[PDB]
Design a binder for this molecule. Structure first.
Ligand SMILES: Cc1[nH]nc2cnc(-c3cccnc3)cc12
Length: 273
């Protein structure tokens, strides 16, 4: 009986994903986030192990939730007559990467290196668990300001990871690869790398590199900020027009720009406190 198990607070945000509120677990005052999603608005349905009809989002969240704190964990969920309700963990204090970039402008490379690495680790974690996120971007990353740790949120556009083609996509267009725009087909990992290339550019330039389909399709990267050559190179690499020309996760993290990352705690002490 959820209404009495959590104390609902202010609304945090709403959109295609639905509506998300601040809340507190009544038992221990654990800070939580309470997400509501309308059944009619749910395009993708999944099967629970015990065989149940449920939003794919819940399926993916269960698969990725455990010790690794690179992803935001699903604590519980409930079915309502016309909606599902998800209880998710909530860091406090917290701020999303989009708001942070808007606040702070372009980020220092040292800090961008830490953040990007943390994301890479998290995305690698989902892939390890058979989950593909499909909407990696600043708005879908949270920053625990005290610990300097980044957390992935919003698995509402995700899918089970597979090695065959995807012919559906419903994440953010300006973050989608050339081959989606052109052919409406992509492969999971190589698409994810492209979006990672967008995200990295966004961290270091304070903005997204492409706005229209034709810019995406052309794939020429102009840098509007001072950015090291290594970083430019890594970014150009992730944004290769041919998917098979993109680096693997291992190649990204072995890149020279990616060397000597700060620990999250260091990161907070230096860049966050
Ligand atoms: C502020 C916050 N803490 N824990 C969260 C989990 N999820 C979300 C979220 C935001 C947008 C869409 N879906 C989930 C937001 C969250």
């Amino acid at each position: 009986p959820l209404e009495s198990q959590y104390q609902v607070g202010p609304l945090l945000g709403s959109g295609g994903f639905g509506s998300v509120y601040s809340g507190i677990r009544v038992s221990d005052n654990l800070p939580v986030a309470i997400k509501h999603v309308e059944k009619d608005r749910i395009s993708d349905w999944g099967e629970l192990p015990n065989g149940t009809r449920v939003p794919m989002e819940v399926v993916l969240l269960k698969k990725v939730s455990s010790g690794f704190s690179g992803v935001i964990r699903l604590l519980d969920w409930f079915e309502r007559p016309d909606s599902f309700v998800l209880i998710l963990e909530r860091p406090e204090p917290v701020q999303d990467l989009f708001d942070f970039i808007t606040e702070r402008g372009a980020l220092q490379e040292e800090l961008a290196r830490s953040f990007f690495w943390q994301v890479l680790e998290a995305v690698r974690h989902c892939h390890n668990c058979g989950v593909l996120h499909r909407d990696i971007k600043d708005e879908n990353i949270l920053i625990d300001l005290n610990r300097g740790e980044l957390k992935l949120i919003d698995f509402g556009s995700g899918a089970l990871l597979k090695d065959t083609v995807y012919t559906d996509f419903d994440g953010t267009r300006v973050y989608s690869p050339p081959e989606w725009i052109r052919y409406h087909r992509y492969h999971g990992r190589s698409a994810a790398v492209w979006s990672l290339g967008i995200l990295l550019y966004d961290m270091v330039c304070g903005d997204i590199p492409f706005e229209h389909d034709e810019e995406i399709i052309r794939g020429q990267v102009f840098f509007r900020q001072r950015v090291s050559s290594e970083c430019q190179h890594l970014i150009r690499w992730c944004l290769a027009l041919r998917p098979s020309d993109r680096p693997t996760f291992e190649e990204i993290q072995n890149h020279p720009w990616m060397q000597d990352v700060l620990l999250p705690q260091e990161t907070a002490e230096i860049h966050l406190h």
